Design a protein around this ligand. Sequence first.
Ligand SMILES: CCCCCCCCCCCCCCCCCC(=O)OC[C@H](COP(=O)(O)OCCN)OC(=O)CCCCCCCCCCCCCCCCC
Ligand SMILES: CCCCCCCCCCC1=C(C)C(=O)C(OC)=C(OC)C1=O
Ligand code: SF4
Ligand code: SF4
Ligand code: SF4
Ligand code: SF4
Ligand code: FES
Ligand SMILES: [Ca+2]
Lengths: 145, 905, 589
Amino acid sequence: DFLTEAHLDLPMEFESIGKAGSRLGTALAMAVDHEINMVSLVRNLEEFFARESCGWCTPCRDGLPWSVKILRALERGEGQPGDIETLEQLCRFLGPGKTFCAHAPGAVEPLQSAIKYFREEFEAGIKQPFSNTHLINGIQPNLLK
Amino acid sequence: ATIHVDGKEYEVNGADNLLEACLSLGLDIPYFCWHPALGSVGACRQCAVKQYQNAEDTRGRLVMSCMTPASDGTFISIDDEEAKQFRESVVEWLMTNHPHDCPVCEEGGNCHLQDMTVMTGHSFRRYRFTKRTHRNQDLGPFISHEMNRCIACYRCVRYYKDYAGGTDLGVYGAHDNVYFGRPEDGTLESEFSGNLVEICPTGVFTDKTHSERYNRKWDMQFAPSICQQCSIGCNISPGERYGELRRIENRYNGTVNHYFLCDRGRFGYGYVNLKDRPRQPVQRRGDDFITLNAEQAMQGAADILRQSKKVIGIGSPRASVESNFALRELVGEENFYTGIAHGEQERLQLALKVLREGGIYTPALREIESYDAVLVLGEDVTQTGARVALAVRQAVKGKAREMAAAQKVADWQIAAILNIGQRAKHPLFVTNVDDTRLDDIAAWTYRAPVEDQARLGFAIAHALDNSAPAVDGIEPELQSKIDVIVQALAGAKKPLIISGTNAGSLEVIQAAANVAKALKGRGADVGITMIARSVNSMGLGIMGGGSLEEALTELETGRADAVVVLENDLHRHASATRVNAALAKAPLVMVVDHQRTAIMENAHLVLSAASFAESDGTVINNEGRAQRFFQVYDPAYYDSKTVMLESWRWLHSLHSTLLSREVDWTQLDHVIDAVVAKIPELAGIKDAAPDATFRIRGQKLAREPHRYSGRTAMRANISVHEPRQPQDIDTMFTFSMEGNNQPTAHRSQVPFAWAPGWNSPQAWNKFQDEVGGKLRFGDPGVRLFETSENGLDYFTSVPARFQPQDGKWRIAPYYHLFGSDELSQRAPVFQSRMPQPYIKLNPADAAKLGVNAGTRVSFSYDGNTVTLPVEIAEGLTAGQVGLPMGMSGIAPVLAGAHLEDLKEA
Amino acid sequence: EPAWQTRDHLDDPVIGELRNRFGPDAFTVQATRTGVPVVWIKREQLLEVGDFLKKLPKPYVMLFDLHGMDERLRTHREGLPAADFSVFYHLISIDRNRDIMLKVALAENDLHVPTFTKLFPNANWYERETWDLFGITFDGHPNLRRIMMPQTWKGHPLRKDYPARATEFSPFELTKAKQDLEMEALTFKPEEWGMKRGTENEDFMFLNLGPNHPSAHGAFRIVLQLDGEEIVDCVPDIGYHHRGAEKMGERQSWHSYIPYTDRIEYLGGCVNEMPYVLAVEKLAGITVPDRVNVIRVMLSELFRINSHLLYISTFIQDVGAMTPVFFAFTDRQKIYDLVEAITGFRMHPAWFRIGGVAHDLPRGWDRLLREFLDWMPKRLASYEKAALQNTILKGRSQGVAAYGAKEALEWGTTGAGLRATGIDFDVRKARPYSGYENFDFEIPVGGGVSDCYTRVMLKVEELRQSLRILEQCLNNMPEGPFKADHPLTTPPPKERTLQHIETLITHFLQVSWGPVMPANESFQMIEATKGINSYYLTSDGSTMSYRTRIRTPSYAHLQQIPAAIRGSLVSDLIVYLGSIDFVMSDVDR
Ligand SMILES: CCCCCCCCCCCCCCCCCC(=O)OC[C@H](COP(=O)(O)OCCN)OC(=O)CCCCCCCCCCCCCCCCC
Ligand SMILES: CCCCCCCCCCC1=C(C)C(=O)C(OC)=C(OC)C1=O
Ligand code: SF4
Ligand code: SF4
Ligand code: SF4
Ligand code: SF4
Ligand code: FES
Ligand SMILES: [Ca+2]
């Protein structure tokens, strides 16, 4: 999980970083500057995490590319209403115990951290309204409210 | 163990996982990757339930019900909001890349993925991006391949590799680009590839033979029946539409053929839908060919039968018990002849004597999978009795199962089972004239003539118990191999000995019986298994009669001026020239059959009988289990001109018209009672299935589903007036949906599996007391005989060593799964699958003859100089010629015979 | 908390009084989605429970329904007493605005129940129908004979083992012997009803009015005894219009049964559709949106105007004026143009669905509705001033076949007659279904007697109220979905079916095998065009209805007929037949 400047004065132990909503891991930290857009950065992380999946079990294999495509739409500004909620439910349903191994919880930790801390960057990628169906000539569509 | 689902207390089996623990009680959990026979791998992540360890627990944990053991004191919730939302999300993730292919899909209305999409209540699609696609491979004449519909549930690779033992289907690809198939295009060469059309939850692997003439599942008219293509007698569900047999589906029998058929029995049904088949009785005056209906044909046949001094009857091991008994009572006890030859009948009588007199318990097909050490003597199981070979593979993997269970690993953790047992497996020793399809797992394979295989069996029997007759003249290397087999069989706990009448020798069966007796004498739970040739070989041997040679010599000597041939081609058990001479000599031949046999030119009368899809009857499989097969459809519903009746009905009406000059179409129950009255040893066939008066709360059993369509229009081309639906007076079923097909009905004969919300072949889970175990309210079919109190003695007549005589060539039988059955080779779909007829030769003998592979060698057997191209068999022993049995012009009676004049031409 | 939830109903005061009277171990309470307290009561205490409910301080003075049920094949009978067959009695207390369903369990061999005819006189035809269709014998019943099937009929049709389809049985061959036997079986035999043919002085003469009479509105036959002109007694013979629609409910799926529910009353249409689809939505757990409720209310009121127009025209013609029926059918043609525009069919629309309607409203229906709402009131005033204020029609109608509130309650009379007797029990107000609380409309209540004229002008006022409801719906119409978003909505929306795969799967499995409603029990009672129509649906968890019971008001009116026309003239009987608003498809189902 990503951490902020306020978490910089935190000891580099397993339990201390694990208390503040992250992990110690390999303790080889990566610094992200203000010039780097977080949506594209998480997009690259998800491309790596979805193209390097082993392909055994359903949620990682068939939900990480969905997050990749959603972040592709957000990077180009073609986001549609309901994508951030989809990403949040995707993070919720790809936690520990849902998948066969621990590749997918580690995949969705940076996504949920970037949703939590940098939600205004993710909301800036939605410009077009939601349109999944197209108008079939001769059939009146159903309009849920 | 005791579990709690939503506050309800359930008593479960603690050695089981939670998924089928809940599925046994009738609790619906969506699942894809788990199968009752394969095991659990935890792949599809669809079976999530929320587990609590205390009775007062709020959070819980989403655990896999197929991967969590059902111990005592687990509080799981299925209909919780979190678990339901996660299962809906998994269904949605599987639905992201699924094609818009349901109308043009062969499993529409038979799809597991459809049932689990509607079960989780997912109907709204918010995925808006592109869908991945895949190319398709040509998997052969049987399996149509459509990889776009896959969900990567890994059932195909698991079954085909870890269960079927096949090597050509595998998993390739990447993260999301997972592919399931062959490294190239070509035919799936496994003999159990047909079960992929029901193992696969989606429409990837589909029945191409059904896809040719395709109808939906609710359009099918089903029936419970027994597969006729060999002696194992796997229970099937034939389903027809528009008057032709459409698709053979698997039928659950918890004791015989639980979840898997073989390809010969699944795709070999094409002979029923042939237009060359006789559908009306046809009478000849010289060259003039006329058509009669039933009454005038019966009266004329009775007149000609009365105008003869002795009427003889030639039965068949292909026909049912009732039809053969009807022929026997029509022609008399002493004038009834079995259609098999003398050697085949001798081997069949010996096999029956060992079964019902040898004192050794012959196991059923489900019970084979638990035996420890397997010795196959002579019988090529994989090409004759293939399901026994699959059960042999299961019994071989039982050792790795045992080491896994010793390490406190539950039985459903199949991945751990193959993890612990890397390559260690139970001993399997197969003997044949060449290499078998069981050589990948066999502890040893003995390639030798039948005399040497019999001598090997006698050596094993002598080296177990010294009272057995010894054979002298064994090489020390073969003696060491004998000692290895002896140490493997004597140290086991449940040894199994598998032989049969397909080896072509009697001493092989004698040696197998002696090995079983020697194993029994040492205090072991030993089982034996004889594989017969045809479906009702065992019943014909139990009833008995003369051989085909005696019938032919009665016809040739002139003492039989009238012969009734029941469902026999007569060229499969005797030479064509002698049969043609004995039939042209006889002044009346009456062939009662459902197939255009070659002897119908000599037939003075042809009676259109009914096949298994159009006739009711009883067949006795290779383990003495009587099984009733029912009628699927009335042939006269669509084609009203069709006079096509049951063979026992034909023969009983002919007997009644011969006696009292009246035509009396009987009922199946009357013939069954006649069999169990006149023949004490066939008395168990009354208990095979209940009579036509059996009702489930007053109503009959439905042959077609409740949503059968087009009742008022499927016959509107002929006449707009829909007639009365046919009435089944013989059995308890009806040709309509006004019947009972609930999963909780007190019956054993199930025509098809359907439950509300369960349309797939996985709907069989509701029809069982526990999922994967026996069928609820017992499995159909009863054993005819029990194990005897005392057994046979030691068979002393050992054979001599095979010395190749010059000039004469001993014929080694090479049985094929596609082509050695009489009726399956008539199917047009098997002609693109069966191999070309090759005569198989040793490299040394081929070099002596100077022939290379590809060239034609002509061989003469009874004035038939027939040419065959040559294949080289290294494993064949010198002095023999390898011939495929059941092919065109090569009968299975050729096994063990000599072959002079084998020259290159 | 939704209204379709399984409510066990221990909060009803009647359960408390029954516990305090018969003890805590005399009956069982069933939790169902019917909205009704279901009480399983032992057979010996059935008459005691009936008398106790009859003698409550605010008693159950109504026997709404009485019918049997075959429970031999019901697999999910958890929480239920052991039974091969059952008999349910649905009773209504109007002053309490409450209702109860008492079920008695019977074995397959001991199929006899104490009769319910003495407590409620309208139980006679229901017990005859239960004996005819289920084989259940009622001890103490006066004349236990078949009422749906002819007397030369073997077997009981509503049993589970009896086949449903005519193609299963032998085809209909009409030979001379069978024609003679069935014509002798249909012959009225006056000694079997104790008719006392003739008198010591002069003979009575028997007349078969139906079937095929210009005054008989359908397949109805009444056998009437005359001394001169006066009627001595009447034997109304029904069963000449039996279609076996309940057995069809056990034969068709949930979605495919909608045209069969639509043809139950062929002047009702969508009004017949509404209780069935509402009961199915109760079974599934579907709450329909506001636009669906408004659309179904609008179509129900349109078909109510059509039915009331036909009823008024037939009453005027039966009195003798043959002119206004043509203009009334012209207004029916206007309604038919509107219904053709919306549903695509004239008279049997088959348009309502599970969780919504079939299509959306086409572009321009408001213009046709405006044209009809302009066309109607002037025509109605013309019909009133031409025939309904005529003194000859008043003489033929006022005071003819009049009955009080006790006759309208003990005989199950509902609709116009019950409101004309002063009993203001309307389903659209007392138990409002399908969002009827959002529409303002008055209820016509008569002065205390049910004349033919009183019923006719109450139906005229009901037509005016339906016009008011249509005006309110037209002026204020929502803009939302025409189908619910529930996954069990059948069929799914069409465009999502055509370009989504989950919706395609749902539609594929819902039209092929049928939607899989869970194993539960539901009930929906509505106010039909001719009275009160109710659907009672038991689901065995399958894709079909395990039991479909349709209660219709014309059955109770036809059973009431001998008690309100005895001693009158044949002309009074003709006017009474014209002023009941019955159709024989409603009577026989
Ligand atoms: C070439 C020759 C023909 C020329 C064509 C033009 C003339 C046509 C004449 C048609 C005559 C029709 C007469 C119909 C008489 C019906 C009488 C009748 O039955 O009245 C009974 C009815 C109810 O009586 P009530 O007292 O309620 O019942 C007692 C039961 N306790 O009583 C009531 O409802 C009360 C009112 C009775 C009205 C009786 C008829 C009045 C006169 C006839 C109608 C008007 C005809 C046109 C007149 C000229 C118009 C310009
Ligand atoms: C006089 C020519 C026809 C005028 C328009 C129809 C008049 C009303 C017909 C009513 C009616 C209906 C509905 C009806 O169903 C019926 O039973 C078959 C009748 O008896 C013959 C009727 O009279
Ligand atoms: S979560 Fe792990 S086991 Fe599952 S597909 Fe992804 S990498 Fe494979
Ligand atoms: S496999 Fe099932 S879900 Fe896929 S297209 Fe075929 S019927 Fe539809
Ligand atoms: S091809 Fe079929 S059996 Fe194989 S993984 Fe895909 S869905 Fe499963
Ligand atoms: S093993 Fe024999 S009986 Fe079984 S399916 Fe194959 S051919 Fe039929
Ligand atoms: S059934 Fe358990 S994960 Fe597939
Ligand atoms: Ca039959």
